[PDB]
Short mmCIF file of C-alpha atoms in Angstrom, two decimals:
data_model
loop_
_atom_site.label_atom_id
_atom_site.label_comp_id
_atom_site.label_asym_id
_atom_site.label_seq_id
_atom_site.Cartn_x
_atom_site.Cartn_y
_atom_site.Cartn_z
CA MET X 1 -0.14 -0.09 0.15
CA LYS X 2 1.45 3.35 -0.87
CA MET X 3 1.26 5.51 2.21
CA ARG X 4 2.54 8.66 0.88
CA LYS X 5 1.57 10.68 -2.38
CA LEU X 6 2.16 14.12 -4.04
CA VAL X 7 -1.02 16.03 -4.23
CA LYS X 8 -0.26 16.74 -7.90
CA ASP X 9 -1.01 13.12 -8.39
CA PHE X 10 -4.29 12.91 -6.80
CA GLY X 11 -6.78 12.82 -9.78
CA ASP X 12 -10.50 13.45 -10.54
CA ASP X 13 -11.25 10.32 -8.40
CA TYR X 14 -10.63 12.36 -5.34
CA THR X 15 -12.11 15.33 -3.66
CA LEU X 16 -10.62 17.99 -1.63
CA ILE X 17 -11.82 18.85 2.00
CA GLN X 18 -10.84 22.18 3.40
CA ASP X 19 -13.90 23.18 6.01
CA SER X 20 -12.34 22.71 9.34
CA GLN X 21 -15.51 21.35 10.57
CA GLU X 22 -15.95 18.44 7.87
CA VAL X 23 -12.22 17.73 8.64
CA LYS X 24 -12.85 17.16 11.97
CA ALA X 25 -15.80 14.92 11.66
CA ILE X 26 -14.18 13.05 9.03
CA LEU X 27 -10.72 12.29 11.23
CA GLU X 28 -13.38 11.33 14.17
CA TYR X 29 -15.10 8.95 11.97
CA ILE X 30 -11.96 7.16 10.73
CA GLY X 31 -10.54 7.24 14.38
CA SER X 32 -7.58 9.45 13.62
CA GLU X 33 -5.50 11.27 15.79
CA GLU X 34 -3.67 13.11 13.15
CA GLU X 35 -4.34 16.61 12.57
CA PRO X 36 -4.19 17.74 8.92
CA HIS X 37 -5.66 20.99 7.77
CA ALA X 38 -6.80 19.50 4.47
CA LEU X 39 -7.92 16.37 3.38
CA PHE X 40 -8.10 14.19 -0.12
CA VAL X 41 -10.99 12.15 0.11
CA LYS X 42 -12.04 9.40 -2.52
CA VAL X 43 -15.81 8.41 -1.86
CA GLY X 44 -16.62 4.88 -2.88
CA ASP X 45 -20.28 3.14 -2.42
CA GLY X 46 -21.67 5.68 -0.14
CA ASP X 47 -18.51 5.56 2.08
CA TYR X 48 -15.17 7.10 2.12
CA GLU X 49 -12.82 4.70 0.55
CA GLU X 50 -9.63 6.66 0.94
CA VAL X 51 -8.70 9.42 3.20
CA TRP X 52 -5.38 11.37 2.91
CA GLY X 53 -4.17 14.54 5.00
CA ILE X 54 -1.83 17.26 4.06
CA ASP X 55 -0.36 19.51 6.69
CA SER X 56 -1.45 22.76 4.68
CA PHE X 57 -4.50 24.15 4.35
CA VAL X 58 -3.76 25.44 0.89
CA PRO X 59 -3.01 22.43 -1.42
CA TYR X 60 0.29 22.73 -3.32
CA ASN X 61 1.03 20.15 -5.79
CA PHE X 62 4.35 19.55 -4.44
CA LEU X 63 2.98 18.97 -0.91
CA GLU X 64 3.20 15.05 0.31
CA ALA X 65 -0.30 13.73 1.63
CA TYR X 66 -0.35 11.03 3.85
CA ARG X 67 -2.81 7.96 3.93
CA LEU X 68 -4.89 7.91 7.29
CA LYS X 69 -7.52 5.40 5.57
#
């Protein structure tokens, strides 16, 4: 499983989440103690198939995202 991925490599099958409150909700949902400021999520079959975070609120293609789910 690839545990790290460059933002620039997140295609259209992913969605960016920046809303502070939604990030918090998601993190609790998946049970993560990590504190990213933005998420890249892949939604699948009515659930979150993947959840990745970046420590920056603004997404830069060069940032490295880390998989949380």
